[PDB]
Design a protein around this ligand. Structure first.
Ligand SMILES: CC(C)Oc1ccc(C2=CC=CN3CCS(=O)(=O)N=C23)cc1
Ligand SMILES: N[C@@H](CCC(=O)O)C(=O)O
Ligand SMILES: N[C@@H](CCC(=O)O)C(=O)O
Ligand SMILES: [Zn+2]
Ligand SMILES: [Zn+2]
Ligand SMILES: [Zn+2]
Lengths: 260, 260
């Protein structure tokens, strides 16, 4: 038996550096929802594992010209990792090159505003110009807008792709900071899960507004032909059915929420 | 090549007989969310198909003594149908014997009451005995309560399994009728999708109360070894991303609303 290499991403509250990480070793350096989930998946499937943080800090996209996959998807496609346990969105283009388990969490694209921003919906954002808006610069949210045929989102993509300066951000943290420092003049499009988490964090100056734009899931991903595929899929189902996944969401989102 | 036999279930608004069904033939007799979904999946996967209503009128459970599966699950397991396109809940015990596509719709177990029934949560139901409560037979909701170790749900099952007269019903229609005729003395445990639909239909005398008890999905199911498995899975993802699944929910839930 070989130790399973797990690719993941520093994204709060999924995977975070522990405050005393420099004094700890291996998997013990990290904490969060996905750290807890990895330990359980490994236990139920009967494997030893090593958490690794994706080298380029990205989720996964295929470059238009080079056809090279980056991010966690790349690590799986190119054989650098055996499994991805992360807030990695199940999409058709990804499912064509890797396998996903059944989803372990639901989400949809959503709008983050600085409190008091006169925006209720995606329609509102598309109808006006004073408030800028954007997405994570690589990921499923950007691709949703790029590939969309619905009029509001098509109009939104047409604005976003040509906006100057760039409305796209390198990390979720950068998007959140931009909202917080822009005095209501920037709104951020991000997954409801991350939006909901930030809403419960000091300085309690952001909120989710409106309905989700779509409905999808995060899944645990393996390269095609992985011997882990079946066991991992069944483990996610078992953990959902036994109430663990709901427990972990409560633990990391709400139990220690900082906004009352 | 060969006409694909689709097993499905008469369940509003997934598969319903059209008002003028007696003067109609084959697939044309039926309408609903899953009728539309089957047409789309067939188109993208390039097959012809025959919709057939499950013989025993059940979703599917395994007899504890004989180990024989019934319902749509049994029809797949024993080779009577090629695919199930229905509101069929993805579960561990089912995933062990059949394959499921990625989910096409999210749901959770929920409570249906007659309007004015003094009940707000599962906790509320468990703490009393004047209001009876039950679930559908041979489905995933029953299994949830049978298997649950969460104290509220365990107490609910202990009551439910022994209650006299029986609190379990054969069909959703039977559960709904029981609520409507029991003058507030029966509450029904059913999936949020079905509950929300019924709440928007005449005579507008029921409602969903409390949050969902769990979070899960319906999937398209195929027998193990099926040549359709990959194409069906990819087609479900295609339809979600194209916005078609969202259009279909709006068509069959919101647009069919009768209660203003
Ligand atoms: C925890 C999990 C069991 O709850 C979920 C998560 C997501 C879905 C889901 C719903 C609708 C569409 N899609 C698109 C394919 S998806 O991205 O695989 N998931 C969905 C359902 C239930
Ligand atoms: N979960 C996304 C990243 C975040 C986003 O795009 O909003 C992905 O897998 O690409
Ligand atoms: N969707 C359920 C049936 C409805 C229920 O059990 O509430 C199943 O697949 O068994
Ligand atoms: Zn466990
Ligand atoms: Zn289509
Ligand atoms: Zn297609």
């Amino acid at each position: 038996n070989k130790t399973v290499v797990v690719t993941t991403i520093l994204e709060s509250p999924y995977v975070m550096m522990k405050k005393n990480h420099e004094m700890l070793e291996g998997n013990e350096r990290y904490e969060g929802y996905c750290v807890d989930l990895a330990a359980e998946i490994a236990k139920h499937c009967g494997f030893k594992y090593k958490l690794t943080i994706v080298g380029d800090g990205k989720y996964g996209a295929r470059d238009a010209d080079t056809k090279i996959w980056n991010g966690m998807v790349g690590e799986l496609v190119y054989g650098k990792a055996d499994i991805a346990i992360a807030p990695l969105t199940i999409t058709l283009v990804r499912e064509e090159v890797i396998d996903f388990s059944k989803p372990f969490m639901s989400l949809g694209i959503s709008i983050m505003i600085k409190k008091g921003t006169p925006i209720e919906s995606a329609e509102d954002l598309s109808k006006q110009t004073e408030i800028a808006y954007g997405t994570l610069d690589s990921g499923s949210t950007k691709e949703f807008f790029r590939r969309s045929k619905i009029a509001v989102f098509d109009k939104m993509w047409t604005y976003m792709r040509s906006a100057e300066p760039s409305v796209f951000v390198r990390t979720t943290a950068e998007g959140v900071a931009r909202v917080r420092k822009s005095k209501g003049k920037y709104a951020y499009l991000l997954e409801s899960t991350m939006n909901e988490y930030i809403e419960q964090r000091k300085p309690c100056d952001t909120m989710k507004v409106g309905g989700n734009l779509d409905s999808k899931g995060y899944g645990i991903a393996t390269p095609k032909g992985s011997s882990l595929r079946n066991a991992v899929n069944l483990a996610v189902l078992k953990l959902n059915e036994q109430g663990l996944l709901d427990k972990l969401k409560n633990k990391w989102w709400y139990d220690k929420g900082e906004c009352g």
